[PDB]
Paper text:
LepFNR·NADP+ crystal structure, refined to 2.70 Å resolution, revealed moderate structural changes when compared to LepFNR crystal structure. The high quality of electron density maps, allowed the unambiguously positioning of the NADP+ molecule noncovalently bound to the C-terminal domain of LepFNR. Small, but distinct, structural rearrangements could be identified upon NADP+ binding. Tyr247 changes its side-chain conformation and bends toward the NADP+ in LepFNR·NADP+ crystal structure, thus facilitating interactions between adenine phosphate and its side chain hydroxyl group. NADP+ binding also causes changes in Arg245 conformation, which also is part of the NADP+ binding site. NADP+ molecule is attached to LepFNR C-terminal domain by a network of hydrogen bonds. The phosphate group is anchored by the hydrogen bonds with Arg245 and Arg235. At variance, in LepFNR the nicotinamide portion of NADP+ makes water mediated hydrogen bonds with Asp119, Arg41 and Glu210. The overall structural adjustments induced by NADP+ binding in LepFNR structure are modest, and RMSD deviations between NADP+ bound and NADP+-free states are of 0.453 Å as calculated for Cα positions only. Here, the position adopted by the NADP+ nicotinamide bound to the LepFNR enzyme may represent another intermediate before the productive binding of the substrate.
Residue numbers in the entry: 7 to 122, 125 to 314
The structure:
């Protein structure tokens, strides 16, 4: 709520407690759906926490931090006296003032981060804790965290391209609702959301997103289903990067029209492929990093990958 980002209003020494309102699964229960045994599981939950927007005035594009209950084995073994699990960050998926501007909650899009044969081998601590939350449970929170990945704070006319993979879709749900419905600013540009995942059933919030597309014209939705589609260029898996190449003109519109690029999701450093595809389109032949830093400097690039 209330524009202008604040960070670290809550640290591990003064956490913020939040009660769980809802925690619903968004992907097929294990065994159902397209992902075969040998490829493990893709269990993605949508999690809604009740908070006091007065005490936790977050801004969409920011991250919330969670502290999983318990003692970190590695820390105890190293004997740290801290021992408590270190914070895990998650992209806030709800719009600044919540859906319907009720200012009553905050939401996350979290996936069980396991390893896996097809059977489980290692089990992510925090992601599973979250996905195991029951309505009424209390969550230890930190933040807000981050103040770079943000929307314009004044009226905007340039086009905006959202590039997401998997859970990276989170920030773009809130941002999409805020730009198209909440209108905290007069936005007159075109939104292009390029969203990628392994299987069609692992694309989450689709009903909502497709609905956004049919209601606006202001908003186009493209998907890259990597394990069901091959790109037309090299016949490899279809990634969002290949979609960018197909959207050469929407890309050019942004490069020359003062638009913005938001890239979010995994795996770590997945922005490289997307960025150097944008560079091909611009035709600029500087080094990858010279082009990337230029865009960021020009406020036309925003990247959060993990
Ligand atoms: C800015 C930011 C935003 C993020 N947003 C989201 C988001 O919106 N949604 C989301 O789901 N995640 C998001 N993440 C990731 C999140 O922060 C966590 O890193 C992630 O959920 C996994 O945390 P974990 O505690 O469950 O995994 P950890 O317990 O820290 O384990 C990490 C990985 O290591 C593996 N592992 C554990 N033990 C071993 C071992 N002995 N040998 C080999 N491997 C092992 C685990 O299986 C796991 O896959 C974000 C991260 C960042 C930095
Ligand atoms: N277990 C792994 O080592 C592994 C495997 C794939 C990606 N990531 C996954 O990404 C995180 C989230 O998983 P999720 O179930 O929410 O969905 P997801 O596995 O993250 O899928 C996101 C999409 O990005 C694609 N991709 C992989 N490398 C890329 C690059 N360099 N440039 C552009 N796109 C790329 C993936 O294609 P693919 O069909 O080739 O994966 C996938 O379709 C992690 O949990 C991790 O599982 C790492
Ligand atoms: Zn509308």
């Amino acid at each position: 709520p209330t524009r202008e980002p604040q960070i670290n209003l809550f640290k591990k020494s003064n956490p913020y407690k939040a009660k769980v309102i809802s925690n619903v699964l968004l992907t097929p229960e294990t065994g159902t759906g397209k992902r075969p045994k040998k490829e493990g599981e893709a269990l993605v939950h949508r999690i809604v926490l009740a908070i006091d927007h007065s005490a936790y005035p977050y801004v969409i594009g920011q991250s919330g931090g969670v502290i999983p209950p318990g003692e970190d084995p590695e820390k105890k073994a190293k004997g740290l006296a801290d021992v408590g699990y270190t914070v895990r960050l998650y992209s806030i998926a709800s719009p600044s003032y919540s859906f319907g501007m009720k200012e009553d909650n905050i939401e996350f899009i979290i996936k069980r981060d396991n390893i896996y044969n097809g059977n489980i081998q290692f089990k992510g601590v925090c992601s599973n804790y979250m996905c195991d939350l029951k309505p009424g449970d209390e969550v230890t929170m930190t933040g807000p965290s981050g103040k770079k990945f943000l929307l314009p704070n004044t009226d905007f006319s340039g086009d905006i391209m959202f590039l997401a993979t998997g859970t990276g879709i989170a920030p773009f749900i809130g941002m999409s609702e805020e730009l198209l419905e909440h209108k905290l600013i007069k936005f007159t540009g075109n939104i292009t959301l390029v969203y990628g995942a392994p299987y069609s059933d692992e694309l989450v919030m689709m009903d909502y997103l497709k609905g956004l597309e049919s209601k606006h014209k202001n908003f186009k939705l493209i998907t890259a289903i990597s394990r069901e589609e091959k790109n037309s260029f090299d016949g490899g898996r279809m990634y969002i990067s290949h979609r960018v190449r197909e959207q050469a003109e929407a890309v050019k519109k942004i490069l020359n029209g003062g638009g913005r690029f938001y890239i979010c999701g995994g795996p770590k450093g997945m922005e490289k492929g997307v960025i150097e595809e944008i560079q091909k389109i611009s035709g600029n032949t500087g080094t990858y990093e010279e082009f990337k830093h230029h865009l960021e400097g020009a406020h036309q690039l925003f990247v959060e990958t993990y």
